[PDB]
Amino acid sequence: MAGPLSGLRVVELAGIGPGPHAAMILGDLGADVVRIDRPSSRDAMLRNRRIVTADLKSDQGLELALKLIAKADVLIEGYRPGVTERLGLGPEECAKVNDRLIYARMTGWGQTGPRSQQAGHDINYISLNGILHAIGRGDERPVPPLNLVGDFGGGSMFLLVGILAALWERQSSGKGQVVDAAMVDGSSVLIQMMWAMRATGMWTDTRGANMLDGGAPYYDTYECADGRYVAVGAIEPQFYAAMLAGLGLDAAELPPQNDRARWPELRALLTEAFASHDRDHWGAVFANSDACVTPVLAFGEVHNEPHIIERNTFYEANGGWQPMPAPRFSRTASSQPRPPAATIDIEAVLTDWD
C-alpha cells in the first residue's frame, strides 16, 4: 500500500460526516482501513477501505470486533457519547485487549456537558461558537458554508491531527490513549485568526463589515457581463494597485482602499468595471498577475482548468471526478484511491492480520 501511513491499521465504526472523512484521508495516505457497518457502496467517501458487516449488538459481532481492535493501531467512532460503552466497545474495554490502541472519538458537542446528548449537524455546531453568525451578507440571514467548517475543517481534520499526534506520543511511551475531537472545539481553533483580530479591535461582530467576510471591496466576488463571477483577493496594496490598472481604473478617482466608510462607493466603481467584460476576459487579462483575480468555476468546469489538469488535483472515477489525496509526499507518494472494496468477511481480515 502506497503512502506515508503504510501499515497503519485503522478500525472504523461506520457513521456519517467527519468519522468517514477522517478514515478516508487515512486510507488515502496508505493506511489499512477496515470499516464495520451493520448488516443494514456508491459513496466515494468510502474509497480506500475494506467493508465488513457485523451486528455489534450480537455476542459474536462484539467478539469479532474486539479481535480486529486488538490487532489495530487506531479506532475511530463517531456516535454519541455512551454508545460504544454500551456495546462493550468503550475505551476501557478496548484497553484491556490492546493498551496501544489510539481511541478516536468524533462528536459535535464533545464527550460531556449539557448538549452532549443532543442530536445535531454541522450548522448547529457552528451556530454556537460564533462562526455561522459571521458568514454571509450583512442585510440577510447567515448562510451555511456547506458542511465544510464543522464536519471537515473543524472536525475530521482535528480527529486526524489527534490520531497522528497520539501515534507520535506512543512512540516514546508505548501506550495509546483517547482522542476527544469535538467539532465545536476544532472549528473554534480553525477560526482562531478571527478571535485574535477581534481581541485587537480588527474584527467586528457585524456581518459583512470585515476584511475577509465579503465586506471589503478588494476581497469579494464580482458579477461579470456574462452573469458568471470572478473572485478578488487583492489585500496587499501592490496587488490591489495591479488590479486597478488592469480594470482601467485610475487610483486617483477612487476612495482609499481601506477607508471602510467609503467601501460602498468603492464597491460601486469596481462593480461597474467588472460588469463591462465577461469572466473569461478577466481570467485572461489577469493570468500571470499578482492582482489576485480568478475565475469562480462551478464544479462541472473544474476539469477544464489548466492549473487543475496539470497538477492532477483530480482523477476520473465512477460517475466523475474526485479529489486525489492531499497533501503530497516526495518519497512515499500516495497512490490513486482504490474504489470502495465490496463487503469481505470479517474472518478473512483477521487471518490477513494474524
Ligand X SMILES: C[C@H](C(=O)SCCNC(=O)CCNC(=O)[C@H](O)C(C)(C)COP(=O)(O)OP(=O)(O)OC[C@@H]1O[C@@H](n2cnc3c(N)ncnc32)[C@H](O)[C@@H]1OP(=O)(O)O)c1cccc(C(=O)c2ccccc2)c1
Size of the site for ligand X (CB under 6 A): 25
Round to whole Å and give the CA distance between 53 and 279: 49
Find the binder of a second copy among 39, 96, 174, 200 (CB under 8 A): 200
Find the binder of ligand X among 52, 56, 243, 247 (CB under 6 A): 56
In the complex, the smallest distance separating the C-beta of residue 88 from ligand X, rounded to whole angstroms, is: 10
Check if 121 is active-site: yes
Which is nearer to a second copy, 61 or 154 (by Cβ)? 154
Question: Which stretch, 32-40, 48-56, 214-222, 342-350, contacts a second copy (CB under 8 A)?
Answer: 214-222
Distances (CA, A) of 80 to 93, 116, 186, 272, 304: 17, 7, 17, 51, 42
Q: Are 109 and 125 in contact (CB under 8 A)?
A: yes
Distances (CA, A) of 260 to 36, 65, 209: 54, 59, 8
Check if 37 is active-site: no
Residue count of the chain = 354
Helices (H), 235-302: 237-247, 263-275, 279-286
CA atoms within 13 A on the CB side of 102: 27
110 interacts with ligand X by CB under 6 A: no
In the complex, the smallest distance separating the C-beta of residue 96 from ligand X, rounded to whole angstroms, is: 20
128 interacts with a second copy by CB under 8 A: yes
Q: Which residue's C-alpha cell is 490477513?
A: 352
Find the binder of ligand X among 48, 129, 147, 187 (CB under 6 A): 147
Q: What is the residue type of 173?
A: S
Question: Which stretch, 55-63, 121-129, 244-252, 254-262, contacts a second copy (CB under 8 A)?
Answer: 121-129
Q: Which residues are registered as beta bridge partners of 336?
A: none
52 interacts with a second copy by CB under 8 A: no
Burial of 152 (C-beta count, 10 Å sphere; 0-12/13-18/19+): buried
Q: Choosing among ligand X, a second copy, none, which partner's interface includes residue 276 (Cβ < 5 to 8 Å by kind)?
A: none
340 interacts with ligand X by CB under 6 A: no
Spatial CA neighbour of 134 closest among 146, 124, 144: 144
Question: Which stretch, 64-72, 221-229, 249-257, 343-351, contacts a second copy (CB under 8 A)?
Answer: 221-229
Find the binder of ligand X among 9, 31, 46, 107 (CB under 6 A): 107
Round to whole Å and give the CA distance between 158 and 110: 13
Interacting residues with ligand X (CB under 6 A): 15-17, 36, 38, 54-57, 78-80, 83, 86-87, 107-108, 119-122, 147, 151, 212, 235
